[PDB]
Amino acid sequence: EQRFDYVKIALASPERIRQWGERTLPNGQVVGEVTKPETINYRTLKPEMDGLFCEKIFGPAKDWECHCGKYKRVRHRGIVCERCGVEVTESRVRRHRMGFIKLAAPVAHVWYLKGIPSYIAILLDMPLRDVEQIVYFNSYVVLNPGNHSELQYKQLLNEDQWMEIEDQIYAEESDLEGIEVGIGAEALQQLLQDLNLNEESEKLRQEIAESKGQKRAKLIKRLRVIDNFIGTESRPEWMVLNVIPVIPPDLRPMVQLDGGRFATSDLNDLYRRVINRNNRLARLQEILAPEIIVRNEKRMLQEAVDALIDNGRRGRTVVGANNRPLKSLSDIIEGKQGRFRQNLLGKRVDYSGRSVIVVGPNLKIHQCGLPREMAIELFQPFVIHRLIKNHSINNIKQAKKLIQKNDPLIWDVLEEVIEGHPVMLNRAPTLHRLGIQAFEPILVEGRAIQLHPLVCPAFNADFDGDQMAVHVPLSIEAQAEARMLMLASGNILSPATGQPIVTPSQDMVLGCYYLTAENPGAQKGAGRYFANLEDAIRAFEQGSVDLHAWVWVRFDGEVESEGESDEPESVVAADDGTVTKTYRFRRIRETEDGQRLSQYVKTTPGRILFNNTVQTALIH
């Protein structure tokens, strides 16, 4: 059945981060750590050996060819060359494999420090300003009060005050041997490692009851977070980073345009800055530098990591060549141009076209007109299949040559390839589901698409510059759905309100109004008598009667008029029990309290034409 059932997200431990980007080789060594800010050689366009584009960590750059050019071919199924360590396989592996960087000093994740709720500050029960001051090397914190009388646990200090306490302790006096541990550094991992979740949970639960108001609510908030860390069995100190993942190199390409130079990518610059700062800090720490220069390097490393994660969230923004900020990892998934709203909820597709639309009368409501140049391109595989199967050619290459050379036979094949295959038409602003519709195409000569006039209001389109897009279904299920769910001859009512949507619109209304109107002038042939509805039409086609004359016609059926009087205007009773009743627009003959014998209607030839057309259309 299905490969997976659900997705889960959680915090990442350093062990998992290391496990993501570490692989072993049949030698006993392990690879995966990046230790150089180098990408490729300038002389020969090949990657370096331990940089951001290395082949031992991420994979070969050419199919079935190792770095030193000594193993090739496909018969090997996963052996490793024993001169450079490059595995011999396809280059697609460059789209999955990850790396990692080991930091000289711990740094704090900026998502958990600068947020609408601050999770580190809430967990530690300290204001955000104090936590921000401990980080970035602006103050000290008392990790252990010792046997002092004024010092308190988690108390902010200063340089002068620390100097005073240092003078007090270093006076070689007594009663101060309580091991005062005041460390102004990251120093957050130590505070987060001293937390006992169960004891704090019990204490908060006990203290909740004897409280009220805004004092209670705050405590409640803290309690929430704490219980979360018990449900997931996570460690609160995982919010401080010791290892950093590195994205696969095929998602941040280098690109070899510019003739002699190279393209610019923004992730590579941030990674290079992080690596440079880490290497400098490690080298300074190795040779036992004075501990006033090391803290500077630690601060710059923290700022570099912060800029890599989220640019401009905390302090100043990193600026490239021109005064333009760089793109960090959080800018790829954030907004209208992010991954979610641009590449996942909408896409570009194959087998699609676009062109200008003109008006085609004499079409049917389920038909459309397609130019041949577009059709020969949108239906290529079907034409190739029909050329191979019928009119046996040989292979695909001969068919492609025939199509390119424009032999007259391909048009005869295409005329029957497209017969019975629906197509989908779309206009740019799709405000409701009637903006996409399915039609049956017929080939036309020209470069414009022909559209039926009766479907324009649904699309909201007129013929003064608009353009349309065309899509082709492929599978049998898609064709069945297009025929039975979206065909343009079955969309009669509006989903918003059950009202008609295919009414005649602009000139048909004017013609039907002129046909059935009144005209006191031009009354030629008025007063004549007719039988059937066809005699009046036949007399009209001979020019013997006008279009707006008043004539009497023999009609048996239901008739409605305008301003007709329900009262019989005249009644005449004759012998043998017969009665004639004359209304404004009718004349009826009846027997003695029985059935009708005849009925004549006073009307106009245009109204007869309209009603005859309607009646005839409902029998075919």
């Binding site: 490969r3 997976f4 659900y6 915090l11 790829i332 996942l344 896409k347 194959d350 279904p473 492929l474």
Partner: protein, 89 residues
């Protein structure tokens, strides 16, 4: 639903389903079922780069056995995956 599913996967970025669909159309056979689009995998890698533990899991049918993580970036069928669709032979 089938029109939408075919639009989203076979015609845009299912790197293996494109060639299968093209060759099935040429040979006149049925179009095989799709797989997973590439953009989802790209998004998963980008999210993992931010130190987030996100993965897909398969439910345990029976017994006490825990749910097992599924490797999305692995090959299921022993068939080629070229960059662009081509007419084989």
């Amino acid at each position: 639903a089938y029109i939408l599913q075919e639009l989203l996967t076979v015609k845009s970025d299912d790197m293996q389903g494109r060639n299968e669909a093209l060759n099935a159309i040429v040979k006149g056979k049925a179009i095989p079922r799709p797989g997973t689009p590439e953009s989802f995998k790209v998004l998963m890698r980008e999210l993992q780069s931010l130190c987030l533990d996100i993965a897909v899991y398969k439910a345990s049918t029976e017994d006490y056995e825990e749910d097992k993580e599924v490797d999305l970036m692995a090959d299921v069928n022993q068939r080629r995956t070229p960059s662009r669709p081509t007419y084989e032979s």
